């Protein structure tokens, strides 16, 4: 048999923007639901830019790009940045620093990096492109580097507008309201040390799923709505289909996460719904349940118990609705909500 | 999947005859094997009768028949009793009470009820008909009410003679129960999904009768190989019953068959069985009925195979019973205690 032991429970709350505050800009990271809707959350890439020479750059290679947080193929990331910078047609030489460019899965998120950089430059010098030109440039960079970012248009819109009002659903408007969902649920990204941080997204957006997601969000407003047609329920229905998909072979970790969450959902009223993804599990809990240590431990134990390979850690990130990309100032620095997380250290050992 | 949980294990042993110790008579209930042989067991219908008026009854409706145990279509049962009583040509008015008229399947057993009543009257007034006439009256009642009682003649013989010596096999013919009894515990197993009311669907035959007769006689040899003993033949019959082409078995019979075949292969104590509409007749090694561990395993296997959730499984230990008789303070202890064990279970769908 196997014995699952909790070797640590470490909760944290931090306000990263206060630490880094030349111009500073932020662009929110996103998470997706039913492969067709995107939510900007309270995690963001920050870009600090300082003009070091008031003259025309010899080329985009002249700018100093600081310690880019280490990640897989970070040299490719530099190439992408150099190309984007080239298209911005800068008239000064800059020193640029990037902070927190990794998303919830720990994967580099190119879109918020480029948008934060754009916002930084927009406030640094004149003659910087508008939003429409920005989208054209971003599409060019994505195509040139063959980046695999499903529903890039919705991701870009979510990054520019944020989700304190809407969830960005693929065009058919097509968006749904987030107010009521937020009042009733805690959105949590759960990940084990076995979930990959490097992967090619395998998503299956569709107009059918887009409509379901939109209606679910809009139905959160009616207190009388049957739970089986609310967001958590549709996330779960989508998750069940994802692991039974004919044109998708799910990861072992996705399969095991599905079994664990299905059990948890049926046993705990606080676990309302979820959807497994390649980088982790997006879970909907009753409001404030994220702060219930007993529940968190039970979720971690269930996941560790079902995973066929021994898990050593399970992280839980509480995701609040995030604002749209913007320049950061002393005046607006508190528009950012602290980021809450809890990580459990685990030991799953074969025993007599 | 599903989770099977045992919520209770309740054993009991009772001596019902002592409770009613006018005239009191008893007639044994029976169980059948291979649809062709009948065994009188240690469960019996009891009839208490007292004359309330020393005069010719105005009609059979005059007798007071106390609250008959509640059962399906009990008014029909009353009609049968009234007709039987009419044929007995009684010369006094009686108050009659019936006790334990339901068989192992929970089904009303007309034959023991009528024979116990006859024995009661035989000891109450002069001129009551003899055994030969009784059989004629019973045949008339069974025909008039179109009762569906397979092998009625063998059932009647078993009720009158008991099985402390023989198993009553359809005429061609009986076998001896002596050897079988020393080596096995006969147990009737039933779940809450087995019907208590049903039309018996049995297939008696001379081929099955001969197999049964020889098996009982072969029990005598301690060298005789099991494949030709009673438990083995019961099992062979059961396998064919669920495979029959002129019988569509019940869902509970099919699921019971699967469970018992698995149990029989894994446990040496489970020697043979036969599924029936009202339950499962199982042959266990002598005294194995008192093995709590085995009993629980049998219950769990049945619950695991049943497609619908079972909530209880009962086990009745059946000893060989004596023939119908008047009960007296002198023979009241000739009845062996009735042993039973019931398990409460929960079979729940789970993630």
Swiss-Prot record, chain B:
Cellular-component GO terms for this entry: nucleus
Gene3D superfamilies, alphabetized: 3.30.230.10, Switch protein XOL-1, GHMP-like (3.30.70.1000)
InterPro entries on file: GHMP_kinase_C_sf, Ribosomal_Su5_D2-typ_SF, Ribsml_uS5_D2-typ_fold_subgr, Xol-1_GHMP-like, Xol-1_N
Localization of this protein: Nucleus
Induction: Down-regulated by at least 4 X-linked genes, termed X-signal elements including fox-1 and sex-1. High levels of xol-1 in males correlate with low sdc-2 expression, preventing dosage compensation. Conversely, low levels of xol-1 in hermaphrodites correlate with high sdc-2 expression and the assembly of the dosage compensation complex on the X chromosome.
GO biological process assignments: cell differentiation; dosage compensation by hypoactivation of X chromosome; male sex determination; mRNA alternative trans-splicing
Stretches of the chain forming a coiled coil according to its record: none
Keyword Nucleus: yes
Disruption of the gene: reported phenotype: Worms are XO-lethal, due to inappropriate activating dosage compensation where only 1 X chromosome is present. In contrast xol-1 overexpression is XX-lethal, deactivating the dosage compensation pathway and elevating the expression of X chromosome genes to lethal levels in hermaphrodites.
Keyword vocabulary terms for this entry: Developmental protein, Differentiation, Nucleus
Domain of life: Eukaryota
Keyword Cytoplasm: no
General function of this protein: Sex-determining factor that is required for sexual differentiation and X chromosome dosage compensation to promote male development. High expression during gastrulation triggers male development, while low expression at that time triggers hermaphrodite development. Although related to GHMP kinase, its mode of action remains unclear.
Similarity section: Belongs to the GHMP kinase family. Xol-1 subfamily.
Protein name: XO lethal protein 1
The organism of origin for this protein: Caenorhabditis elegans
């Amino acid at each position: 048999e196997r014995r699952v032991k909790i070797l640590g429970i470490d909760r944290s709350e931090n306000s990263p923007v206060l630490t880094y505050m030349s111009k500073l800009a932020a662009a929110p990271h996103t998470v997706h639901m039913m492969d067709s809707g995107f939510l900007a959350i309270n995690r963001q890439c920050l870009v600090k830019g300082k003009a070091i020479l008031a003259r025309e750059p010899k080329s985009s290679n002249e700018h100093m790009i600081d310690d880019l947080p280490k990640h897989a193929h970070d040299q490719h990331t530099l190439s992408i940045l150099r190309d984007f910078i080239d298209q911005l047609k800068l008239h000064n030489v800059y020193e640029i620093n990037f902070y927190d460019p990794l998303d919830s899965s720990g994967k580099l998120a190119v879109i918020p990096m480029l948008i934060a950089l754009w916002k930084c430059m927009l406030a640094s010098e004149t003659d910087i492109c508008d939003q429409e030109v920005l989208k054209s440039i971003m599409n060019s960079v994505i195509a040139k580097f063959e980046l695999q970012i499903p529903c890039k248009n919705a991701v870009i819109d979510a990054t520019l507008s944020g989700s304190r009002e809407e969830v960005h659903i693929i065009a058919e408007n097509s968006n749904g309201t987030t107010e009521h969902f937020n009042k009733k649920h805690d959105l949590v990204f759960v990940k084990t040390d076995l979930h990959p941080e490097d992967f090619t997204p395998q998503m299956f957006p569709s107009q059918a799923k887009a409509k379901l997601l939109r209606d679910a969000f809009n139905n959160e407003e009616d207190e009388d709505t049957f739970p089986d047609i609310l967001v958590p329920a549709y996330m779960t229905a989508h998750s069940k289909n994802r692991v039974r998909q004919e044109d998708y072979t799910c990861l072992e970790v996705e399969f095991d996460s599905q079994v664990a969450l299905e059990k948890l959902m049926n046993e705990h009223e606080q676990v309302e719904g979820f959807e497994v993804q390649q980088g982790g599990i997006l879970v909907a809990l009753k409001k404030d349940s994220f702060f219930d240590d007993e529940l968190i431990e039970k979720i971690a134990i269930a996941i560790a118990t079902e995973s066929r390979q021994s898990v050593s850690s399970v992280s839980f990130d509480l995701l609040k609705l995030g604002p749209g990309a913007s320049l950061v100032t002393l005046a607006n620095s508190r528009r950012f909500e602290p980021e809450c997380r809890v990580v459990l250290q685990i030991e799953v050992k074969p025993v007599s």
